[model samples]
Target chain A: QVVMTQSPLSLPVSLGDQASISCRSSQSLLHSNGNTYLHWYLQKPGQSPKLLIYKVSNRFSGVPDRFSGSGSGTDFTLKISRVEAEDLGVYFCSQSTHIPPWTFGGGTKLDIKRADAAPTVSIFPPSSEQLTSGGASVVCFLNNFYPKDINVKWKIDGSERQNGVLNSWTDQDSKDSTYSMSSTLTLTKDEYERHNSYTCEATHKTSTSPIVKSFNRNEC
Target chain B: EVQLQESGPELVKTGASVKISCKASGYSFSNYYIHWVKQSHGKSLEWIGFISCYNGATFYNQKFKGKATFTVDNSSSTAYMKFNSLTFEDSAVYYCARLPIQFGNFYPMDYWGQGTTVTVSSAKTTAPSVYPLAPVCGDTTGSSVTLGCLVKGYFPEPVTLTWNSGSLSSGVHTFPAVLQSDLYTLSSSVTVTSSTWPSQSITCNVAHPASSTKVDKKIEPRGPT
Candidate 1:
């Protein structure tokens, strides 16, 4: 395994700022040929690392032109021209020319400034296949709220659910430097037709007034 | 729509008493005096007892005896359980529920608390913490080797006692744990044939979460009859 010396450790950014995070391979990743197996990747929270630039320069499809890479051997760099909000998370410089143990440099965290944003929510209608099986469930999606902490609570017929299975959240790509999460509520077929109002109350650090979104019996 | 909330310290030490206060809302508090129950992981719900809001009368499981005391404050609609002489055994989740008395003075636990836990470091007790003296032969079928374990003291976690003698250990029967005093004493027994008592290697393991202290005894066979 080769030692990777990565620098800065954390790259702090705000909207529209240009930032450069550096990573260097120990002995160099340059193979016998000109090609270097060095790749730059970003791992968003709760998601896998996505290829931002492969072989030090070419951008992966769909990645914004704002992200670029350059350099060779022990001195490689990942440069973000515009440094958009979605560019937060950890950046990695990995190598594979060596077998048995491929190594990557210690990551440099992309620390975006924190903000207080109320979540926008959408509760999906039950799937047709689900309703066919007599068991019904709804998926409530909370999007882009700043600060990773938030919760989803359920209420049926205007009564707070006495704690059923509480659910977890996910990270929405930070186009605005925020977070996103999801919660699922399961209802028996008989229950689906019984209650008229099922509300999802979200409590976030941003506000004392719970953000509530209501669903009706007939409306999905 | 009634809800019960238990408020208390999560940590308690040995050699002390802790009081749990429960607040009930949503209905006329007088319907029930708020029955408090003690629960240890995987054990049966131990009915600690209850106090009356309508009338200060109280009832308890015979086992609770004096270990638990009850009080009620109608002004704020709260019920309290003061556990005395706290010990590791006394550590558990204490909850309260509101139930109305039925025909023959039966109370049903309909509403409950939102999972309250009380962990303890140590508890106060004059309870004798010791092993048994010796097994006394009772209605010994003369052939039956009596195996007795003197359980000195304990908390709510029941003591599990076992007897063993190789093949004889399998299916060895014993009774459930029972207490005699606040600071306690209890015993369990296993019977084996006299021949199985000697070279058979008679031994017993007393299992309790509180203490890992082990005890075993051996008795010599009759000297050449």
Candidate 2:
């Protein structure tokens, strides 16, 4: 088995700009058969993974010429000559040289930095059915964000809460290509009654302040 | 259009030296590098080393430095590998593959010579009968076209299948070898996009070590309708 490592985990690109991602293998990618087993793939937001390059440099079927791969042995690079709008996704380098396990690089995210794509934050309180069922939770939704960089946090009375918080993967909207994600914080009914206020905070690159949504226990 | 064929002594006793020759044509032999690969009985391929035909410079796998030597005869456009102090471990099929320099680096091997079997044994062994089926295009309207190759009637288990000189790991499936009447049979198929099948040359190469036989079958490209 071989281990794959990728660099520049976050890549910012604009239309017409060139982007390069590096992938390093713990072992030689060249097999005994004289073929390099390193291949490149792209997984777009909300889409399946697509093969971009095979056998180190040969473009896969229907792959545009702009996507090129180069390097040998343990080091390889995948370069996009001119980035396009539709190329917002993560690029992964995978190797199938050694047997027991085929490995993949951690992945490099290709993102667009836009000021106007700030996300809208909304909070939903636990419904009556959820409370009656003895499981209470608070949900925070972030919509229409550009790129996938957003940090979410849950707080109780100005104290950060770490346990029982789950976040969903960012998904791209079909109409505008913006990204959306949600986070949930689970709480016991007793814990909910003990807290005076709970807050959901989201931090984005374009915002000077964290987008805040609070639920006062008195509202119930 | 490059073509290569390897020939040498069919059998040799232990402790005897053997020299295998690879004759090359259809391209400039002296301008590129030739690599030697080994496939022992029931084993995967191994890199023996490479030789520069232009200058006779040789680099060997550390394990084979003293066991093997390379020589060339530019007058005849042939490359040779001589085994020194042969042992039973040296019994395997040896192949010479061409590596064309691309972008100032030796590219992947694209053309290969039929393997030469350098057997080190006092007794005889049986070789498998190999047949490479001509690739048949499965569907034109589909997103991909499937190409199939069948190999049968071989004794001893291990055989290597290559597509266009590459052991392609994707979209390729090789079934388990089935024993039938004291012989073995197997089939392998590769799926490629319809656009690539019409113009690209797809070659199915079967390299078996038992009988020192290497056979290749190429898919005939379809003409534009």
Candidate 3:
């Protein structure tokens, strides 16, 4: 029956980092029922706040294997192991032990900051068998970009390229703290025959300039 | 790929009852508990209750007892929550979540649908009620000006706000809506470049499920010369 708020309201965490968010309450949540009534939630990106933990130790349901909860009485902790990019969002806490209408703690939002190690980018030109009379297909690869905050764009002779340009989802690298994505650009085969030249440009926050790779005359 | 979808009337009349549906697919319906909760625009969440898809579990909020009925259609893998009595208080957005329990800690709803807002005070409409803004302009440069669209007193919560210029448009970068006790207020801002200013009409559009037609608000970078 008290008002409590979580401090350090925001958190910027890195991939593969062990992080913890805490919520403090005015009075001890210890209930006479031999249970403490603290709870946790995460309102992650585009979705409503979810019940992450309930009554202190137990998780609500279908949470990832990486999230764990502990602490007794009033001190509660929601610990995440090797945080994933998808874990970014606002985390909330509630005390159910209070009389009726439940009160939640000020949210703790997770933000991803720029990290070192930009993805190694490359462009693969279409093979003769893959070419159509109308055009040729090309693939641009972005690998191992840390933090997954990289943008891949298409370029041809310094001009913006659009339409038929498909970008893939940024996938988290399972082996390390990095991410990878690939996009394909489809243009008239003449851009290849005439060698108008196509470039795969990568932009990451850490980079002062965009990394570009142009198609070569060697690829049929 | 387990998925959950929510459906309800675009708008519900005040003092009238409404039933919301959450349909689940890709898994055994009875294996998971479908949870429901209420979220007011820009406010903390309120838990209503949860009922398992398989009739395995059920829970309720003491405050919501008799106010809400949690039922399911096992033959169709659809879960339902019916609010008996309605008011502006029940106007916030409601979401249906699938609770995946485990041997370890209990987690929150990993899967939920776009919330369906129930406007208990209004008749059924597919559009959101939008209030126009005078659009306060501030910090004008020789060529650009900052525009603030302070839209207040709109509700049934969960509306889409967008800023549009001639060809340039930005999604409503909204700060959380403020629930002042019973109703909700929302606002968004943008910097309109003078280069793109006068060529065409600049306006804000508010889209919601409550009304059949969308609500649009037209504004200006500055007062009429």
Candidate 4:
């Protein structure tokens, strides 16, 4: 059985304090086959976990160089040079060295330790669908709160479908003390009918979660 | 927009070795480096090392000195690494990483293999009387040079060890087996000296019976400040 050991499951850091997490393996992962197997991930507040380092030392795509990984075998280190306001959250170290059952560190939470208003919203049904003359239209619906900035797009069977228009509007939250909004896409019937399925996805800058919907005219 | 899929078995017997393969799709294989990493049962991550797709240049984690070996097939854009003398502790998920193209000032990994898992079990071993102690490196120097290496448990009767410096031929370092109650252990070390060191490396090469390739590590000296 493969096992990983992580330290300081929770921590509190100031705005600029450096934070770190360690992942240790129960066995020597080093072998003649290659290098040890280790990776580091960061879960910033509400964002999805982003890969920071892979293969023990190299950084991942779009990751800042300020974040570095070093160490070998079962002992490894994930370091963040200068912590930014956006870098507040928990970090996890995972080992994919073994097979079938994958394992992750217990994770270390980095909290602000201060009361600051951090706005959050949840969107549901994430997607909707409609058919037009040249293509098919997809809509991503968000309930609970209205997002100040939002984007929507349409894709047909994983490829970007042209001749599709996107639109969004806000709705009054009559039941609760909040507002809601939705984004929609209109696609040409030709493109919609030719493609197997159309998808609508919504993205927000401040939030890590994304909402998506799919439609197929053939099913109708 | 390339993707990788790793295919391999889920379990391996202790004292035996396992090899996994990563298949690449949607891009030219010659343009990227395939990197492998491992995550154990409940731990963080570790870098196994990476293989150059062009000329087969490899840089490995010193800790994996003898257990991990990396190779590639450019014709098929597939990368492979084999783990020898597996133990119950060697079980973990393995992933293959695809390095991004050098665009102006940007170079990084853009894609990753879904990952494959391998587990080492004792009940599956045929011959399990003795296990080999993973190779070890150690040294002492002025505030200039230092040495370190990874040591893990392995299985077998006996293993060979070697030492080298840069491109120069160095003397061989031999370690003896000592019995501790019911267990056996093997260890080795290498040393180097420098005046104004800028992170120069020293390596200890370990050879085992099951595998022919020697696992080596470049040691970065950490001296007194």
Identify the leading candidate in terms of TM-score: 3
lDDT of 2 by residue, B12-123 (tens): 7768899899999999888888878786744434668888887888888778889889988999999989898888789788878776654334234556676777767544
TM-scores of all candidate predictions against the true structure: 0.29, 0.44, 0.52, 0.34
* 10 residues in a row with least lDDT, candidate 3 chain B: B131-140
Task: Summarize candidate 1's per-residue lDDT along B119-154 as a digit string, tens digits.
Answer: 665434332232322222222246544444444446
Task: State the local distance difference test value for candidate 1.
Answer: 0.62
Q: Model 3, A23-129: lDDT tens per residue?
A: 88888878776777787777765554566667776766687768888887667888888988778778888776764435567777675645568766645555333
DockQ for candidate 2? 0.02
TM-score of chain A of each: 0.51, 0.77, 0.54, 0.48
lDDT of 1 by residue, A112-153 (tens): 756678876544434444456675555555666776678888
Q: Which digits, one per residue and each the tens of the lDDT, describe model 4 over residues A1-220? A: 4687777775555556667678888876564567566777775432334678877877877899888888887888788777776675668776656632345676776543332221221111111111211223233343333333466666768886545343333322223322233333444555445666656665665456656656444442
Off by over 4 Å in 1: A1-220, B102-104, B123-225
The parts of candidate 4 lying over 4 Å away from their true place are A1-220, B101-108, B124-225
Model 3 residue A31 CA deviation in Å: 9.8
Candidate 4 chain A worst ten-residue window by lDDT: A121-130
